[PDB]
Amino acid sequence: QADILPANYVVKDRWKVLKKIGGGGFGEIYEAMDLLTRENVALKVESAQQPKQVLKMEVAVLKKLQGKDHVCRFIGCGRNEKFNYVVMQLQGRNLADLRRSQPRGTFTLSTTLRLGKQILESIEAIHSVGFLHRDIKPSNFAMGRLPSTYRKCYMLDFGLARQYTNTTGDVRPPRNVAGFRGTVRYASVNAHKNREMGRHDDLWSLFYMLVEFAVGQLPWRKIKDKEQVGMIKEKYEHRMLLKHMPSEFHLFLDHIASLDYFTKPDYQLIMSVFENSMKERGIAENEAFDWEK
């Protein structure tokens, strides 16, 4: 109905809103200027009157992940009468926009495999601190916007994230039904069947992304009905998806198909598939990205 923060509004006498860059549902994201440090920042705001409060745990997750790569630096957070906010490091173009920018809407295996390695490190990272992301998709990963960071992929929105552990590190018992409230294009069949998601379901999203990066489409690309996408995925011969993909990816598929809610994944196996695939084709970490020149 209206922006929570209007343009040139200033938060806690430090962060001057510039423009709206995201939001619409369950909160808003702003580009803002840090009047102290003089750099532009990501300012996420939730209405304090809002019923469902995700920004609390976003901060929680974002705080446990400080000191790991592929995670935005935590600047500030605060509560007040009209809104809650978090202040973050600003990142660059997300992978969804970067894939649409390419002709054929595809990435060379050079880029696809190197993105896979970074995305997998950060999926292991969030798992390492007892949280599922549960919204793994290209628009939730961005390249840095600095000389130090322009070749680093960052994991972005922790608003659908869930704690699968406790302090002791025991796995939390699943719900018989947990309703899937997310983008269905990269959803695993478990998510589609409204079962408690696991670490595997984040790797299912990783799998489906890397296919769409290399092939340029998924068989269910057109369909906008949630039920139909799930029934197509439930029956589809996933081997087909690998027809034009490195043969090592068959290892990736067979492993994730074996896992259930409780089984910790082999993150090193999946990482090997990418390393080995690059190894065979003489791809190296110093090689340019399709959007560079």
Asked if residue 136 is part of any domain, the answer here is yes
- CATH classification at residue 152: 1.10.510.10
28 known member of a binding site? yes
Structure tokens at 24: 């619409």
Any binding-site annotation on 227? no
In this structure, the answer to whether residues 22 and 107 fall within a common structural domain is no
In this structure, the chain runs to a length of 293
Q: Is there a binding annotation on residue 44?
A: yes
- 87 and 108 assigned to the same domain: no
Question: Is residue 253 within 8 Å of 242, Cβ to Cβ?
Answer: yes
**For residue 56, what is the enclosing H or E element?**
helix 55-64
**Same domain for 157 and 258?**
yes
- Kindly state whether residues 85 and 140 are assigned to the same domain: no
Give Dmax over CA atoms of the chain in angstroms: 58
- Same domain for 101 and 62: no
Pick the closest to residue 49 from 81, 24, 73, 17 (CA basis): 81
What Rg value do the Cα atoms of the chain yield, rounded? 19
146-163 residues labelled b (16+ CB within 10 A) or e (exposed): eeebeeebbbbbbbbbbe
Which of 73, 91, 109 is a domain's end point?
Answer: 91
What crossing angle do the helices spanning 199-215 and 249-258 adopt, rounded to 10°? 150
- Structural method: X-ray
Residues 192 and 215 in one domain: yes
CB atoms under 10 Å from CB of 111, counted, come to: 23
CB atoms within 10 A of CB 287: 13
Closest CA to 268 of 134, 124, 136: 124
Is residue 156 in a domain? yes
Resolution to one decimal, Å: 2.6
Tally of domains in the chain: 2
Residue 229: phi and psi, rounded to 5, are -60, -40
**How many whole angstroms separate alpha carbon 62 and alpha carbon 43?**
14
Statement to judge: residues 142 and 53 lie in one domain: no
Tokens found for residue 23: 């939001």
User: Could you list the residue range(s) of the whole structural domain that residue 244 is in?
Assistant: 92-293
- Does residue 126 have a known ligand-binding role? no
In-domain check, residue 212? yes
Residue 165 lies in a domain: yes
Does residue 213 share a domain with residue 170? yes
- Output the DSSP codes for 118-153: HHHHHHHHHHHTTEE----SGGGEEE-SSTTTTT-E
Residue with tokens 């990269």: 186
Q: Can 135 be counted among the known catalytic residues?
A: yes
Decide: helix, strand or coil at residue 18.
strand
Q: Give me the catalytic one of 13, 34, 135, 157.
A: 135
